[PDB]
Amino acid sequence: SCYIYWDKIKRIASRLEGMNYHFDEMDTSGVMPLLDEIEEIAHDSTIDFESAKHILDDAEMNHALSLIRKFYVNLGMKLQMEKAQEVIESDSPWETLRSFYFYPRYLELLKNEAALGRFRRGERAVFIGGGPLPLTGILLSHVYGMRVNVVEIEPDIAELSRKVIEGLGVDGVNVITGDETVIDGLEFDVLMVAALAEPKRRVFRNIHRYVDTETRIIYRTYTGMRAILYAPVSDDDITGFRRAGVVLPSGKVNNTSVLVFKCP
Amino acid sequence: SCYIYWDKIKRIASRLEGMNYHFDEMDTSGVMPLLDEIEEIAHDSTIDFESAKHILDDAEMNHALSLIRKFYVNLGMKLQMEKAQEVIESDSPWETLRSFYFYPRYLELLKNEAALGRFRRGERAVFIGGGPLPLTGILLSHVYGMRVNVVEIEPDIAELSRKVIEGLGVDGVNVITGDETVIDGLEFDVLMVAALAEPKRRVFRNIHRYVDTETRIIYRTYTGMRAILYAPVSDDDITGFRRAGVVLPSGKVNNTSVLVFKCP
Numbered sequence A, B: 001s002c003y004i005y006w007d008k009i010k011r012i013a014s015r016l017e018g019m020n021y022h023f024d025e026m027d028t029s030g031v032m033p034l035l036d037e038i039e040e041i042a043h044d045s046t047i048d049f050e051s052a053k054h055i056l057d058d059a060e061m062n063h064a065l066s067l068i069r070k071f072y073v074n075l076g077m078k079l080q081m082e083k084a085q086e087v088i089e090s091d092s093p094w095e096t097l098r099s100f101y102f103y104p105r106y107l108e109l110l111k112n113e114a115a116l117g118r119f120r121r122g123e124r125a126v127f128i129g130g131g132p133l134p135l136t137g138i139l140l141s142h143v144y145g146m147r148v149n150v151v152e153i154e155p156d157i158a159e160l161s162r163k164v165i166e167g168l169g170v171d172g173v174n175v176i177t178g179d180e181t182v183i184d185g186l187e188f189d190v191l192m193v194a195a196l197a198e199p200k201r202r203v204f205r206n207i208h209r210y211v212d213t214e215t216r217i218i219y220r221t222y223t224g225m226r227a228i229l230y231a232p233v234s235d236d237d238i239t240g241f242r243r244a245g246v247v248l249p250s251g252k253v254n255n256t257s258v259l260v261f262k263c264p
């Protein structure tokens, strides 16, 4: 075809490949302009899902797509690690948390998820894939009054997130070190699967093993042009589950949120 | 998976299988309830596009899908034929036209397409694939004040549509007997491609030959669960064009309308 975005994407990828930013080296503040350029294309409302799929599925786009996704994931992770440490050291930990680049979008996302999942105060939530800054975990208690167990696979990352939570004094948010298989030892009303919880198919296979058909499960994915940011969850990934509600994002929110229930 | 809609579809497919009628011979009034059942599923706003695709692409659905499509197309053509002749014989042609099952849906569909295509009074439109009841061509003139040419391949169907237009006393709608290739020698501001214009790949090929890059082209297609009604236009079909706007339907409107321009 002849979409003006094709060349815009290729020019971004050319700069990413050319600079070859290393996780340990990348200056997080210095590459924010690039993140904005990528998000400008991701968040563009005039691009329909058919066209997005046209572009992003093309064999000639594969290399460029892979560069953009790698940069986005690396930059997101680096921002989380930086913010986590800043919160731990801050004279004002909540103020510090609130100035996190993605904080406003997470409020918007979680409000839509809370409606989708009919969250009630006191309910027990598990969040799979906390990372260094377990922001959703934090908000589920601080805004929604839920009792939260966050699951994180990397021991040093899980410990950093404990320190974040302790530095904030958020009520009722615990961190369990391990993979999604630790949910067998937990009792919960709502389960949420982080956009970064991987590998998706194994994750959902394990969830299926341990949950019943009444448990509300929400997962985060990418649809439309926002799929430039990260690979979407596939239908095959959720075998054994039925979709029961979707929230498509608007504004600067990246994720699509999907409610599923386990099939009988 | 375990969608409730799956069993609902199989049930309709078995009622269709149950008929002794051949679909080109069925009584139109007697099968309206089956149409209603199919439309309830197609029009269900709770079914997300990913789930729809899950159900419709499924191997086990191949035959139920083809059967429901064959029924829907045969019914639609029969309703058109019957209505065209009824309008021709009526002492109140406009009243008769307004009683057409899909009439109010077309009012809504065209209103949205008029915004999508930026229609203006006195502009020239070509509609590819009129059939016996050239309702869109009629509305384009009578409501939107456009100067219309309708193209219809079958000589007797084309002649029937001329009689309908005359009976209604609508000015500014001509019918040309021919395929899409007739557009070579016409000057027009917008081209519209009927949902029924076939075969899509050849039709778009020819269009591409005879239009320039500034001409607004709108084609009608099916997305989401509404794909149960008829096969969608593929991206391969539109090679050489870019999408520049999409209207997804709500309510009981079946078609998705897509604005495209030819690529430089």
Ligand SMILES: N[C@@H](CCC(=O)O)C(=O)O
Residues within 6 Å of the ligand: A076, A080, A102, A106, A129, A130, A131, A133, A134, A135, A136, A137, A194
């Ligand atoms: N990953 C965070 C959200 C903030 C971020 O994306 O870095 C979470 O666990 O909710």
Ligand SMILES: N[C@@H](CCC(=O)O)C(=O)O
Residues within 6 Å of the ligand: B076, B080, B102, B129, B130, B131, B133, B134, B135, B136, B137, B194
């Ligand atoms: N096919 C008609 C509309 C009526 C119908 O769908 O049967 C058209 O060209 O607009």
Ligand code: NA
Residues within 6 Å of the ligand: A080, A129, A130, A131, A132, A133, A134, A135, A136
């Ligand atoms: Na996190």
Ligand code: NA
Residues within 6 Å of the ligand: B080, B129, B130, B131, B132, B133, B134, B135
């Ligand atoms: Na028609």
